[PDB]
Structure 1
Amino acid sequence: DDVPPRIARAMENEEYWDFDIFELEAATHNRPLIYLGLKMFARFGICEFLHCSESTLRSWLQIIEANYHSSNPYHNSTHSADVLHATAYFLSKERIKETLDPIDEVAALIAATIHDVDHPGRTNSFLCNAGSELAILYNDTAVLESHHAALAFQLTTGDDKCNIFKNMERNDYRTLRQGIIDMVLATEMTKHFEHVNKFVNSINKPLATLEENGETDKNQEVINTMLRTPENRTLIKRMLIKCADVSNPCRPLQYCIEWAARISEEYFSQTDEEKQQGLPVVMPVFDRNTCSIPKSQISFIDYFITDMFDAWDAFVDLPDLMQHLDNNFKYWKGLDEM
């Protein structure tokens, strides 16, 4: 409502995939998550669902955004706004709209918003090796992933001005809470192929068998019955949050390159401190004095992204992302020049 001009225009084409998140970031002065959050939450009707006022939502968006680190190149409020944008975009897709229910839409949007809150610009392994208080607290197991959700619920429920969950039913909140916790914990690296295997085997292969057999009215209910089961809806939520979290290789070229530099700069900054303090180098290839970012991005896309978005694309149909993925992959190849 009370929105300045440049920032209002910066959120013009926000249903579209080609959306300039950095123009929002620049216009908003490192506060894009509250501005993009209010519009997305209003579009998805989330406070109507949660029974909150706008004032509670504004206070909730500011306090969690405040706890994102400006110092971090990549892991800041603009990343989680970018992930919020990707999440909302996937929810808008026809497959996801008719598969998932209204409570999942709210879980995903909240989960995305908080998914890297108070990220220290460092990996879990670093925090275990460096002897961090979170590694002791979370027992070297999902250290950041547990911390993000835990802090996010510490900040939300601990103050009445921030508590967006206060006017809900107790049983509905527990269902929504478990949905958020599951999707925030689903973002960890170590369980990548665990979650991707499940998605191809549980959803795509059975769905391919159904389309292979035919496409009758009765067969359509069996496809709906299979996917809409609570077990498979969780599997889709995990694949959605994971794809949103690493959607930057599938962006318009200018955004892809910016995102690649930011995360590259983080990993170099960690590598400097690993060398400096006298720690074991968990990420040796990501050094500022030896890493080819164009080669690393090719390897990143090959090892994780391509198979993941292949499964996710088959399900949702994301031609623009795949068309952008191929274009960026060819650009990163093109920087050989000798």
Structure 2
Amino acid sequence: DDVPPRIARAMENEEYWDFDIFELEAATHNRPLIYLGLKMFARFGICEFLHCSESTLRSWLQIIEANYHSSNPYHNSTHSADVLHATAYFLSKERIKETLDPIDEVAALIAATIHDVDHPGRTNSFLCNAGSELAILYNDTAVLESHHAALAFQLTTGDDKCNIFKNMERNDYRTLRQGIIDMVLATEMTKHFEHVNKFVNSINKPLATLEENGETDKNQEVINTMLRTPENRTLIKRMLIKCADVSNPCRPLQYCIEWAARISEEYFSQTDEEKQQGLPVVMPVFDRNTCSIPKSQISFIDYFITDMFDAWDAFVDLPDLMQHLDNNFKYWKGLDEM
């Protein structure tokens, strides 16, 4: 409701892919998540679905945001707000609206918001090599992701004023909780190819086969019937959050560059600490004294981004993202100059 002018302007056209997330960051003084969250959640009528107070929502968003470390160059609440923005953009797509149920939407927007809560700016392999308490707690398995999901629920249901799930019927909540957990866990990168390949084999290939029969009468019905099964909506949701999570390369050039600087600095920090403690260095390439950020981005894009967005774009139709990805890939290439 009552929001300072500058912040109101910063939340300009959050519906467009081109969005100045850094101006929101500055305007909100490192509190972009509560502002974009409230607006996004309202535009999607989430409390009206969970039966919560716009006041209980604020308390929730506030506690989740506070548990994102501002000190992290990359994994701070701004990254979360950015992922939330990409998620809403995807949910707003015809293909997605025509495939997911409102409860999947709720799961996605919430998953995006909490997916990295309390991230320490270190990778899972680092926590394991160090014997960090979280690594011991989670038996060196999907350490951070399990933690984001768990801590999130502990903060939410641990206080009546934060519990945006308080007024839900056990069954509905139970299903929403499982969906949220599934999406957060799906962000662990070691499972990257498993998730993308399943999406390609169960969504893109079968759909191309049906779309060969043209776009006639019952044809479409057969298509919509197949895409809406619980199994497929799950694979679609996993793909959606994964793509929102690493969508930086598909953003306007200025933003793309900033995101690359932030994540790189976070990785360099870790490398300096690993060698300092004599711990095994996991990202030998990510050393601030040896690593070329543009070349690293190129490799990153070729390895994870290209094929994954290829598949996502074929299913949802995202020319804007693909054009940005091409332009940015060319920029990093153009910076060679040598």
- SS of the aligned residue for 1:267 comes to helix
Superposed displacement of residue 34, structure 1: 0.2
Superposed displacement of residue 2, structure 1: 1.1
Render the CA deviation track for 1:225-265: whole Å, top value 9, x for unaligned.
11000000000000000000000000000000000000000
Render the CA deviation track for 1:74-96: whole Å, top value 9, x for unaligned.
00000000000000000000000
Distance 1:20 1:214 in 2: 40
Alignment of 1:5-84 (within 5 A): 5-84=5-84
Gapped runs of 5+ residues in structure 2?
A: none
- SS of the aligned residue for 1:99 comes to coil
Render the CA deviation track for 1:263-318: whole Å, top value 9, x for unaligned.
00000000000010110011100000000000000000000000000000000000
Superposed displacement of residue 114, structure 1: 0.1
Superposed displacement of residue 157, structure 1: 0.1
Distance 2:337 2:183 in 1: 42
Superposed displacement of residue 176, structure 1: 0.2
Distance 1:194 1:12 in 2: 37
Distance 1:337 1:191 in 2: 36
Superposed displacement of residue 13, structure 1: 1.2
- SS of the aligned residue for 2:120 comes to coil
Render the CA deviation track for 1:17-68: whole Å, top value 9, x for unaligned.
0000000000101100000000000000000000001110000000010000
Superposed displacement of residue 4, structure 1: 0.3
> How many residue pairs are counted as aligned between the two chains?
338
Distance 1:253 1:139 in 2: 40
Superposed displacement of residue 214, structure 1: 2.0
Superposed displacement of residue 217, structure 1: 1.2
Following superposition, which runs of at least 4 residues in structure 1 exceed 2 angstroms of deviation?
Answer: none
Distance 2:20 2:12 in 1: 10
Superposed displacement of residue 97, structure 1: 0.3
Distance 2:327 2:311 in 1: 19
State the TM-score, normalized to the length of structure 2: 1.00
- SS of the aligned residue for 1:164 comes to coil
Distance 1:152 1:281 in 2: 30
Distance 1:307 1:186 in 2: 17
Superposed displacement of residue 211, structure 1: 1.1
State the TM-score, normalized to the length of structure 1: 1.00
1:300 matched residue in structure 2? 300
Distance 1:255 1:130 in 2: 33
Q: Percent of aligned positions with the same letter in both sequences?
A: 100
Distance 2:216 2:161 in 1: 52
Distance 2:95 2:162 in 1: 33
Distance 1:82 1:318 in 2: 17
Distance 1:108 1:215 in 2: 29
Superposed displacement of residue 216, structure 1: 1.6
- SS of the aligned residue for 1:167 comes to coil
Distance 1:331 1:149 in 2: 36
2:141 matched residue in structure 1? 141
Superposed displacement of residue 213, structure 1: 2.1
Distance 1:336 1:104 in 2: 43
Distance 2:201 2:249 in 1: 25
Distance 1:267 1:159 in 2: 35
Superposed displacement of residue 219, structure 1: 1.1
- SS of the aligned residue for 2:162 comes to coil
1:105 matched residue in structure 2? 105
